[PDB]
Structure 1
Amino acid sequence: SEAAHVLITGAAGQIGYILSHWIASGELYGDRQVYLHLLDIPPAMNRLTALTMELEDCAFPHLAGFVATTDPKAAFKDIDCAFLVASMPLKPGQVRADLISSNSVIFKNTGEYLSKWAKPSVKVLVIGNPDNTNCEIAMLHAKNLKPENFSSLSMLDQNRAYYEVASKLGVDVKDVHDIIVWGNHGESMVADLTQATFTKEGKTQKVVDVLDHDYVFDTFFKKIGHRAWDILEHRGFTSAASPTKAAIQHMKAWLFGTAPGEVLSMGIPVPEGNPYGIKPGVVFSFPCNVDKEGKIHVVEGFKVNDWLREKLDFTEKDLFHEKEIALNHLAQLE
């Protein structure tokens, strides 16, 4: 088999460091070799060199080679998949509208690089914040690609929710089922427990029937909402290993398909005729599975109660608003 070419942007950063090694260890593509494309910006070149030296020093049998560069063409040329980790951070005194705007330029350019140089089959996983909107913008500016080529990462939030709920219930994570993260990141993200069940002492029950209302519809979302901050406070730096784990998990599912019964939250271009009443035109986290051909599908059969309907409508509205901010910013530049 020919090596799979895998792009990681922001490669010199903490996520890039772990992600590149984990992929080079064989965990993503199985027996197939990987050829890493490692992109970062000019001031990061020494850290990038250091990364390459440690990759070399692992003598990884799955590593066919690597590009380590500041050059977009070399980074994007003939790639099979991409982890778009890099993004513009919020600068002091800026608000979310600024974050969306500054990143819209980056992701327009990235969409252009993808279309121009990547394989038409490239699977692009958008991680850098604001991910849903960055993904929409890249897709809109990738002329020779299609919606199937794009998704955004919501699995970190899903995994956080599963551990929180399992710990609250005093059961194993494997014994909790059908927790879903819908919509956007940020304030409007829907951490949905209304489908969720758990097993214990031979009984399967709904989480919402056992846990306190005050926990489910207040305390729980605050915990999920402040988790990253809490880690930053303790660590001195933002999360790295846990988003990396989720990123590989998402991409591996996207490459080979999901397991029987598995439901993975994934941000995708909204499918026309999805069963949950979401309007096409944004990238929206849905409960998904992936078939053996590597195609993502929204999982059918979940229920939308009044609470969930309102939450879904609110995050939908939020996504269309972010998109309008991004596109208006780009249009003003034109």
Structure 2
Amino acid sequence: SEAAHVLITGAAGQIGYILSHWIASGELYGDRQVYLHLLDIPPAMNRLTALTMELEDCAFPHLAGFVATTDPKAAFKDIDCAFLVASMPLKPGQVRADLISSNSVIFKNTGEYLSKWAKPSVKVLVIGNPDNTNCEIAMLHAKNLKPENFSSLSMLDQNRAYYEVASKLGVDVKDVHDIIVWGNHGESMVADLTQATFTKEGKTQKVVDVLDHDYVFDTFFKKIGHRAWDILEHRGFTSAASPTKAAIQHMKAWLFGTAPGEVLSMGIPVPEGNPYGIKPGVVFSFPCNVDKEGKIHVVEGFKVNDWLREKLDFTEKDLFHEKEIALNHLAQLEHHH
């Protein structure tokens, strides 16, 4: 077989460094070889060279080759999947609206590169923040691609939730089931425990039937929400290994399918006629599985109580608002020209 071509943007950063090695080690594509397209900006090219040197010094049997570059054509040409890690960080004094705005241009341009140069079968995982909206913008501006080509990463938050709940309950993570992260990232994200069950001593119960209401519907989202800050506080830098783990997990499931009973939160273009009353037009985190053909499906059968309904409606509203900001910013720049 021919090697799979894999793009990583912002390749010289923390996440790119780990992600490239992990993929080159064979963890993503199994026995198949990989060819890495490694994209960054000119200031970062020395760091990027250092990365390629270490890749080389691993003598990876799965690594068919690589290109390290600042050129979009070289980075996107004939790729099979992409980890869009790079984004424009928040500048001092900026609010979220400005973050959405600055990134809208990057992701418009990236959608255009994808459509022009990537394989029609390309699987694009959006990681750089604001990821749901960056994904929507990239998709909207990729004329030869389709919704099925795009998703955004919410698995980091799901993994955080699983560990938090399992620890609280005093069980292993494998003994907790059906925790879901819905909607947008950021403040409106819905960390849903209302479906969740756990097994302890051969006894299976619902999480919300055992834990205090205060914990579930207050303390829990608080700990999840301040987790990244807490890591930065102690580390001096933001997370790197844990988003990488989640990214590989998402893509591997997307490529080859999920396991029986497995439910992974994934940001996807909202399907028309989804069973949870979400309006098409944005990228929204749903409970998902993936079939052996690599197609993502929203998992049916979960229940929406009044609390969840309100939270879903709020994060839906939030996502359409972000989209509006992004499209308006692009329209204003266009008008100015």
Shift of 1:199: 0.6
Partner in structure 2 of residue 260 of structure 1: 260
2:34 and 2:326 map into 1 onto residues whose CA distance is 34
3-state SS of paired residue (1:278) = coil
1:260 and 1:170 map into 2 onto residues whose CA distance is 24
Partner in structure 1 of residue 176 of structure 2: 176
3-state SS of paired residue (1:65) = strand
Shift of 1:331: 0.8
Shift of 1:293: 0.3
- 1:266-285 map, 5 Å: 266-285=266-285
Shift of 1:263: 0.1
Q: Does 1:111 align with 2:111?
A: yes
Shift of 1:69: 0.3
Range with greater deviation from structure 2 (197-206 or 42-51): 197-206
For residues 221-267 of structure 1, the C-alpha deviation after alignment (integer angstroms, 9 at most, x for no partner) is 00000000000001110000000000000000000000000000000
Range with greater deviation from structure 2 (40-49 or 198-207): 198-207
For residues 200-239 of structure 1, the C-alpha deviation after alignment (integer angstroms, 9 at most, x for no partner) is 1221100000000010000000000000000000111000
Shift of 1:275: 0.1
Shift of 1:333: 1.2
Shift of 1:121: 0.4
For residues 284-321 of structure 1, the C-alpha deviation after alignment (integer angstroms, 9 at most, x for no partner) is 00000000000000000000000000000000000000
3-state SS of paired residue (1:151) = strand
2:267 and 2:277 map into 1 onto residues whose CA distance is 16
Partner in structure 1 of residue 321 of structure 2: 321
Q: Does 1:75 align with 2:51?
A: no
1:259 and 1:201 map into 2 onto residues whose CA distance is 24
Q: Does 1:31 align with 2:31?
A: yes
1:236 and 1:263 map into 2 onto residues whose CA distance is 33
Shift of 1:32: 0.5
1:274 and 1:233 map into 2 onto residues whose CA distance is 40
Alignment TM-score, normalising by the size of structure 1: 1.00
Partner in structure 2 of residue 291 of structure 1: 291
1:183 and 1:200 map into 2 onto residues whose CA distance is 30
- 1:210-229 map, 5 Å: 210-229=210-229
1:55 and 1:172 map into 2 onto residues whose CA distance is 35
Shift of 1:118: 0.3
3-state SS of paired residue (2:83) = strand
2:332 and 2:291 map into 1 onto residues whose CA distance is 41
For residues 170-213 of structure 1, the C-alpha deviation after alignment (integer angstroms, 9 at most, x for no partner) is 00000000000000000000000000000112211000000000
3-state SS of paired residue (1:271) = coil
Shift of 1:2: 0.2
1:63 and 1:201 map into 2 onto residues whose CA distance is 45
Partner in structure 2 of residue 97 of structure 1: 97
2:102 and 2:223 map into 1 onto residues whose CA distance is 29
2:327 and 2:165 map into 1 onto residues whose CA distance is 38
The total of aligned residue pairs comes to 334
1:63 and 1:203 map into 2 onto residues whose CA distance is 46
1:128 and 1:164 map into 2 onto residues whose CA distance is 24
Partner in structure 1 of residue 5 of structure 2: 5
Taking only the aligned residue pairs, the percentage that are identical comes to 100
Partner in structure 1 of residue 146 of structure 2: 146
Unpaired stretches in structure 2, ≥5 consecutive residues: none
3-state SS of paired residue (2:29) = coil
For residues 116-153 of structure 1, the C-alpha deviation after alignment (integer angstroms, 9 at most, x for no partner) is 00000000000000000000000000000000000000
2:31 and 2:331 map into 1 onto residues whose CA distance is 45
1:46 and 1:20 map into 2 onto residues whose CA distance is 16
1:145 and 1:166 map into 2 onto residues whose CA distance is 40
